[PDB]
Ligand binder design. Structure first.
Ligand code: PRO
Ligand code: PRO
Ligand code: PRO
Ligand code: PRO
Ligand code: CA
Ligand code: CA
Ligand code: CA
Ligand code: CA
Ligand code: CA
Ligand code: MN
Ligand code: MN
Ligand code: MN
Ligand code: MN
Ligand code: MN
Ligand code: MN
Ligand code: MN
Ligand code: MN
Ligand code: MN
Ligand code: MN
Ligand code: MN
Ligand code: MN
Ligand code: NA
Ligand code: NA
Ligand code: NA
Ligand code: NA
Lengths: 444, 449, 442, 442
């Protein structure tokens, strides 16, 4: 269905090689497999960088890019075809599949890599790889180099330089292509439908996990292999726990529900947070806190455009929230003073957003040249201001305590401004209450 | 939601300590956490042995059992309360919760383990732990021992014996208590409802993942934190792959669907397989294979009772399937000869079941004294015969190729034979077709269920 | 049938905490269970105070209210779910039921209360509870406090103040909400029908228990789990015994029958007394005493309104009954003098009413600031004057001896007066005789 | 009414004293009174042992038997006559009643017991009483002994032996006299009529308590002061709850109704269970389970006779029910192995009966000399097999789930067999359906 096309992976290989120095080689392993318990495996997730360059879904693989190589620049080591093992575990691409389906120029059994990779590294000046990212692989690499070190007298010369690959490759990933935006847009649409379903099913007497079930249900019907991250479904006081994950508490009349969840499609994330009343009607205190957050959400979009700096959106949300907290009497004093003294962090103690991509907290440098990154079209990020009044915050009136609200949207920088991908699930008080009322009467 | 009660964890601790030799100590770590991608963690799953003795859900904890320690036989190292960390990741039990909620005699911050545990090990004759299970922990233990070794000046004596804990503990786990059976019944019931919904929703044009959605939906509505294992949803020829997990193929009219899936509840597994026609009606070839597997399934139960040995169920399914394959003309010859030469393995190449429990493939010794284990009440296992005609099997008529069937139930040995936990989801041809037809009809009428 | 809704119990919880001093805690146990004989239990009745705040019907439970508590102000300790026991004894709510169905913020097994409750008491300034109501609980509480002081060196501080919860909570119960009046209306209606049936079935030759049978039958068909109190069915001279309960005498021609009986619904009482002739016809002497009691009954309602004080209705019934007794010749002299010397107590020796609510003789202070409480809307009470002439009272003519009469209604105070809940069973001589006559064929 | 005659109580006292060793004394207190809520008391129920020996209905009494005492062997402490209290409370027998209608040789006000009883105990070798049965009485006895011991210097000799009265007295109660059988027979007849009325009135749309209303109605019309136990009226899946007492569910078409209920008369129990279809027609599955329980019920009687031991009836019901479950396919295997390994307990998890008498689970030793008690004429017991299929029992076909059936009768061992007292309410499918059909039409 919606996916990155085979040719785009080739294009990305080309773009990385075009930034490598001549006579160099880049090497990337696939992600490891993990055992969840005894012999039951965790769901497999390909490494984002390796996936970005190959689209190859299997474990036990290593790729090499060798610019200018006569027989072909892209080499893949992967599992061999094995009829007995594939009877149990599923089909393998094999070396023919790697060349044919996945576009490799040459492909070799993963079991033979020790007998082959050293020869390909021999004679190159630089090796590009993710130093420190996978220490097990880093040791494997040093062994291959030591093999070259033995023949030095045969005139085998090992490379003299190791260069950090993530610096270059993550900067590529920071600029989303049209097809990437397309996949993220689709993921966002699936996630928006999921959040709506959670709003429509919610009633007092259910548990937090009932709403998580609705989310996973819609995620998977959309084709998601897994969420972009563990879903947060936090009722009542639990909404003040930023990464609450118990998802096991009974839902009570009068609770707010905070839901931070998003699917992933073809290894591209979506990330949405909505907050809504469990009983379908915001109390006056809930409504006031919610609409303040919504004001900060809406203000942040005005500071996301080409030429704006990364932090401008966050700073806008700080201004809005601090001013609102003063208006409500939850903070006393001068807004500029309170910001300088960071008094708002009693209520809003996290950043307004992060890069979004193949990892939900995506790669890419937030600072360049001792300055905040300048935004350019194709960059994608979240906007997620929040307010959390702890249940034990004695400095505020009792009716405010235990209220947590976050409103998060996914956005892409465009030439003239930005594009919001998550408008498909509403966020005004009116639309939310309308949506929940309609579902309530349909069910009855 | 059903769960093991606090008192049962204490009884298990006592039973284990009653088997340990005097002046010994047992040590178990919690399961590690794994990064899934970048800074996104995998869903956390407590180590089954650690969970079995503590019920403690947090990572970075270590438990110790010290029989006869006057100060308290059960010691738990765990995270301490940290307000900034909890604002983000959630509340922690802390040392006070460990003693109070989880019944520990003493509790210490996990950060202090290096300064406390060597002293508890010192003077003990034996340390019981899971040799080789957690290499990182094995390294920690050797450090603690080296620490004791270096206090000979003060007269410290390291233990000289290290005993594999799994021998005693996994035999305890093999005998399910009444409370354990109650949790497993509930898990099986939840899984049964999930399999039914998959059947009711299936139609050509959907994808395999649409059915997996229904499974996860029902699992989680029943309280499951996760499946017992990654769900297998295999349409058509994919059913001939025993652990198919791509789950991404479009369903075609005429396909069979094989679903192997089960939730887990409070870390106790359920494991069900059902096969059904994607269009609601078994073809004649599909029905012929299906009824033969069903015959094997039913026959296996007759050999599960106190006094029977473990392999008897599997042999019965081998006789039934081999005899039936000859009957249908898929094999040729004498049934007894075909079994002796394993000719059936071209169609039925796996075992008829496994222990069932906190791990799907549960712990417990299948052979004692070189012979197959004798069954006793409380032992739990699966029954899962199957037949798989590979798509490229040229030794049989083309109409049979690409057909795969497995029918799996969960059972517990009782004083009177066994108890099947998974009858909640039907397995005869009539019931399956009736179930699917009813749902199609109700859906056409826009009735809600 | 009708019942207090879940939200009202929460409203009452909130109202009580609004009056507790800050950093305090209130604790309430459920009622105990009693063995009737060998291993047969008595019917279970929840403690009215505990029920009033929780609606929770189970024994072996304790509630706690902790104002301002960050993780929830309402904690309930109750029984754990148990498959083997529930197979015999019936379903239990458990901790999940306590949170979901009954609205607890937190819930713990009753078996762990010793490990949890002391920690919740620790650091509180003040503990509200019903001193002396449950001595076993009082003892239990002292143990919990001892756990706190044993940790005194660590900075664990026991509370320094214990406050009688009855003062606050029973004053709450004294003012009936709209939902409470609705329940009490229904219970009164059921009891009215029961009284009618007893009148319609009565005839000489039956026994008192035959009439008690009709009462219990109608009570239970209306949903009552138990009467509000042991029914009194007193024939003839038994009507001169105020708390007659033998209910085993044969009804004789010429007997009066006095019936004091009412059901309770969702732990709310009704309380009705009617007197009537066994043979359907008041004798001249019976009628004379009866209509005098009825005059007192009717007069009392005129002194039940906001602004009046509690004892005014009683005083009115005293004036009416003494005056009538003189007029009929059973007393002799000046009415005001007779009242000063309580000469009427030879015939009318109890008070004209009591508060009415979750207990038949309901809670609530009759005197405030050394004087009779001023009535306010929402208060509920009974009106039950009577006259009882002992069979052996030689100071009056023989024709009066052995006559006992009481006429009791239930009343709620309103904005401008009162509402009588029990008009559904008649009390005039004419209506009563007509009722019994009409039933004859049937 | 039917009741134990005053001569029989005297006989019982003589029989007990004839089993006491010389120069001893036996002491039994009345049952305590309980408060139900606030000042409302629970219905009073005399202690069965005290009742059995005295017939005396009041609380606040203590009896003493002093064999061979010249001034009178039977002494009763009880409330003294008090006119003011009687005016409110009810009439008291007083000391006049005690020596009068109740036949005491001597009688004293209970207020003076501390000044008289020790003198009666002093000089006796043994004291017979019910160790541990009434802890309040126990400490009172220890005080009375201590006051004697304080006089040891001045010649007083306190008894040195204290003997469990239960063992002698409960063995007497196990053999029912002719009059006791007459009383139980009547109680069973009353309960029979009550069960019939429940069947006749039942219809979908009623609630369980409407049927309990019919039971209490008929009980009380027969003279019962209380049921022998709280009535169980269990509709639908509630029938699998062996002592279900919520009695508050709506009755649905297709439900079975299980009613376990019985009145007591003069403190003698009856105990009947019948199961019947709410709609008057047993479904095929309901019928098959019902008929199997009925076969077990009828079979039990063949093993109740003198010389049979107590458990033979129960063993018969186990045998019959297991075979029938095999025949129906709810169990699979060899019947004898299924019996030996108790496979039936998944469906039939209680005993087939109990002694029956003044307490519904009556006193008496089930085992003598490490063996089951041999039956003798005069012993009384119940027969109550049942089968219960939980709604979620997936080891059986769906059509059986949620069916609960129990069929209970009361029985007296006779010289050649047993006598069933509860035949007055039918139990065959035909008679039940006919009974319900006739009532619906009329
Ligand atoms: O969950 C949150 O609120 C913050 C947003 C930035 C990353 N984590
Ligand atoms: O190992 C076994 O017994 C089964 C066969 C298929 C999946 N697991
Ligand atoms: O308390 C009262 O007022 C009434 C008088 C008769 C019985 N109770
Ligand atoms: O528990 C008891 O004593 C009886 C036996 C059957 C059901 N009720
Ligand atoms: Ca237990
Ligand atoms: Ca309600
Ligand atoms: Ca607090
Ligand atoms: Ca006689
Ligand atoms: Ca055995
Ligand atoms: Mn988020
Ligand atoms: Mn996030
Ligand atoms: Mn985010
Ligand atoms: Mn399986
Ligand atoms: Mn399996
Ligand atoms: Mn499996
Ligand atoms: Mn009254
Ligand atoms: Mn009254
Ligand atoms: Mn009264
Ligand atoms: Mn019985
Ligand atoms: Mn019974
Ligand atoms: Mn009974
Ligand atoms: Na527990
Ligand atoms: Na279908
Ligand atoms: Na006349
Ligand atoms: Na006994």
């Amino acid at each position: 269905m919606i996916r990155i096309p085979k040719s785009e992976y080739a294009r990305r290989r080309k773009a990385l090689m075009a930034q490598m120095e001549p006579n160099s080689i880049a090497i990337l392993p696939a992600a490891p497999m993990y055992i969840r318990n005894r012999d039951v495996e965790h769901v497999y997730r390909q490494d984002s960088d390796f996936q970005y360059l190959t689209g190859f879904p299997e474990p036990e693989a290593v790729m090499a890019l060798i610019p200018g190589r006569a027989h072909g620049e892209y080499v893949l080591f992967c599992r061999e075809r094995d009829p007995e093992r594939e009877l149990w575990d599923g089909l393998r691409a094999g070396q023919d599949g790697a060349i044919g389906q996945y576009g490799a120029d040459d492909a070799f059994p993963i079991g033979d890599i020790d007998d082959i990779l050293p020869g390909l590294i021999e004679g190159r000046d630089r090796v590009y790889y993710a130093l420190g990212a996978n220490p097990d692989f880093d040791r494997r690499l040093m062994d291959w180099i030591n093999v070259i070190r033995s023949k030095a007298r045969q005139g085998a010369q090992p490379p003299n330089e190791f260069v950090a690959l993530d610096h270059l490759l993550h900067d590529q990933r920071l600029y989303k292509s049209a097809n990437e935006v397309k996949v993220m847009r689709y993921a966002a649409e699936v996630s928006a439908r999921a959040h709506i379903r959670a709003m429509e099913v919610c009633r007092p007497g259910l548990f937090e996990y009932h709403l998580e079930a609705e989310l996973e249900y819609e995620f998977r019907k959309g084709g998601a292999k897994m969420p972009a991250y563990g879903s947060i479904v936090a009722a009542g006081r639990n909404a003040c726990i930023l990464h609450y994950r118990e998802n096991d508490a009974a839902i009570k009349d009068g609770d707010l529900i905070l839901i931070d969840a998003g699917c992933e499609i073809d290894c591209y994330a979506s990330d949405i947070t909505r907050t809504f009343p469990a009983n379908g009607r915001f109390s006056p205190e809930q409504k006031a806190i919610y609409e303040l957050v919504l004001e900060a959400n809406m203000a942040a979009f005005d500071y996301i455009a080409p030429g704006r700096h990364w932090n401008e959106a966050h700073e806008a949300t700080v201004r809005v929230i601090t001013a609102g907290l003063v208006r409500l009497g939850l903070l006393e004093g001068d807004v500029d003073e309170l910001i300088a003294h960071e008094a708002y962090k009693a209520f809003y103690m996290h950043r307004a957003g992060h890069w979004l991509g193949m990892d939900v907290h995506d790669v890419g440098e937030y600072r360049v040249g001792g300055e905040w990154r300048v935004l350019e079209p194709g960059m994608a990020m979240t906007v997620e201001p929040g307010i959390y009044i702890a249940p034990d915050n004695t400095t505020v009136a009792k009716k405010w305590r235990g209220i947590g609200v976050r409103i998060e949207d996914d956005v892409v920088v465009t030439r003239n401004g930005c594009e919001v991908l998550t408008n498909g699930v509403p966020k005004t008080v009116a639309e939310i209450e309308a949506l929940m009322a309609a579902a309530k009467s349909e069910a009855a």
